[PDB]
Design a protein around this ligand. Structure first.
Ligand code: V7G
Ligand code: V7G
Lengths: 305, 305
């Protein structure tokens, strides 16, 4: 029993974190085989962050301008290249701790674990969701750039996020591991706005199923709804539309609990319209939207890696 | 910016988890140097869990009755002993991944990270607090016994919890790494009640300071209070009394924010009496009590390990 915001064990990623220094600037990099991946703006100086020309900046660098440190062992850079907003530094040593891994670009609404790092040293691990507006509500300070987000599947680390930026609202933006930003953001020192965000409906439903599996049923009701009528309510409350694909993905939780998806939708409609009336669900007084259906099955069933 | 329930990186603990089997029963153990630590009720059979005599059960076991598996390498047990509610199995191989470590018994109100494990394999990591009634609100299923809780200080893992039991209310109970239960619990297959719980006042105050550091100030007010008057309110709302020691420990956060501790106490009093009125603090509609003052400083300042 119980239900927590649970991250993946971070050990396989910890062994990949290094520190990359170019001139005055230091941030984190990810060392996999004989390549170190980091945000390309490690090459920027103080007073052209407003709109740097990165190709023009990189052609002026040499390998010896990049200091890469793993623990306190220096790794010699023997090549460099830029892929989108990520710098790839070829080093003379393959990381002996390289796990099985893949790079994946996730969809909004998917969750991942973040290993927050400073100076190449891990600080903590927490779970995040990619918001519908392609930001994450992380916890990151100066020096955290190049920290990564990941999921683990059996033995395999799927890296999905590298940290680049904090927006004026306090939320965070970054790229996939091939250096493409999530969202419309760009890597320059400018105030950038995210689109308006919405609540991840399929995840709220998954968490309601988690509450039922764990013995909370006070919010259930005898009603059902159609997908169309539910989506008219979702829109009023700034919830994402629920698709038949979402309904299908919720199938397993529906089967385990005996509660049809559209019956749970009627519970959510009543919660949106009436609130909780001083009650809580899984220890929360708000409707939680950062657990996917897979996260619920993993934690209520106990999958390991 | 941002503030998350952040766990310690788990890699140093992952490398210590093993699987211990005695007859039909399998649970997790912790392999440090040449000793494996696990809950002693690994030696119980189905139908004397009601009140087993563990000394009488252990004298009937031999080393070859204990199967210890690290990954899929079997470790030969060469000695065994019982310390309180923990079994210590001496094995023929020292764990080459043993981190610097200590065993510590924590006070209620302190937090720690849990590495939930099944069959010796880590599943996830999350942050917990030891409640005032000596339970934890964990997330644990059948097979999770022997999972451990820990803190990390620079290079050193301080192990503080080993998992043993789920109470009828769905909360969890266990021991220190020397096998002494937190709370009044015993290791038998019986329904046991925890004392009534209370809210960890000093931690709520720390989290209010975290909110201020991160730019939330709506709950502040122009008032102060005396420690005595505040504690009369705390008691009415089932909050733990705030001591001068707590006030002193909050000193650093008070200095960084410019808000005297007793001024923050007046904010908390108003929140207890009036509620939040539809507003949130750090993304929560409830007052959060599972961050210590140290947790706040660590995360708002960025300490690494
Ligand atoms: C990240 O650690 C980096 N720092 C540096 C420093 C020098 C060169 C390159 C980099 S990357 C840093 C992470 C931030 C810091 C605070 N909380 C975080 O998550 N990222 C940045 O500082 C980033 C660098 C850009 C070149 C991408 N800039 C911003 O996040 C940023 C800049 C502004 C801003 O400029 C006028 C206005 C408003 C908001 C804002 N965010
Ligand atoms: C833990 O994984 C163990 N399982 C076994 C199985 C065989 C021998 C030894 C052990 S330890 C298990 C963790 C539980 C399971 C569900 N969620 C958890 O956290 N711990 C137990 O199962 C534990 C064993 C005791 C010997 C300590 N028993 C309980 O947690 C328990 C027993 C009761 C109960 O019995 C009548 C009534 C109400 C509640 C309850 N909890």
């Amino acid at each position: 029993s119980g239900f927590r915001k649970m991250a993946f064990p971070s050990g396989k990623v910890e062994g990949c974190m290094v520190q990359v220094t170019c001139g005055t600037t230091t941030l984190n990099g990810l060392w996999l085989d004989d390549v170190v991946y980091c945000p390309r703006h490690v090459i920027c100086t103080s007073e052209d962050m407003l709109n740097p020309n990165y190709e023009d900046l990189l052609i002026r660098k040499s390998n010896h301008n990049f200091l890469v440190q793993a623990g306190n062992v220096q790794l010699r850079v023997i090549g460099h290249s830029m892929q989108n907003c990520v710098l790839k530094l070829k080093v003379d040593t393959a990381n002996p701790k390289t796990p099985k891994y893949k790079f994946v670009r996730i969809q909004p609404g998917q969750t991942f674990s973040v290993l927050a790092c400073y100076n190449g040293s891990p600080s903590g691990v927490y779970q995040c969701a990619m918001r519908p507006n392609f930001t994450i509500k992380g916890s990151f300070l100066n020096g955290s750039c190049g920290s990564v987000g990941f999921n683990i599947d059996y033995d395999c680390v799927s890296f999905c996020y590298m940290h680049h930026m904090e927006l004026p609202t306090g939320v965070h933006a970054g790229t996939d591991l091939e250096g493409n930003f999530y969202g419309p953001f760009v890597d320059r020192q400018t105030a950038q706005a995210a689109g308006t965000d919405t609540t991840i409906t399929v995840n709220v439903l998954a968490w309601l199923y988690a509450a039922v599996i764990n013995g909370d049923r006070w919010f259930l009701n005898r009603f059902t709804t159609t997908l169309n009528d539910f989506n008219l309510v979702a829109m009023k409350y700034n919830y994402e539309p629920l698709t038949q694909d979402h309904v299908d993905i919720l199938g397993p939780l529906s089967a385990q609990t005996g509660i049809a998806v559209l019956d749970m939708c009627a519970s959510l409609k009543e919660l949106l319209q009436n609130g909780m009336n001083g009650r809580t669900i899984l220890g929360s007084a708000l409707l939680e939207d950062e657990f996917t259906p897979f996260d619920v099955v993993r934690q209520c069933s106990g999958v390991t890696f």
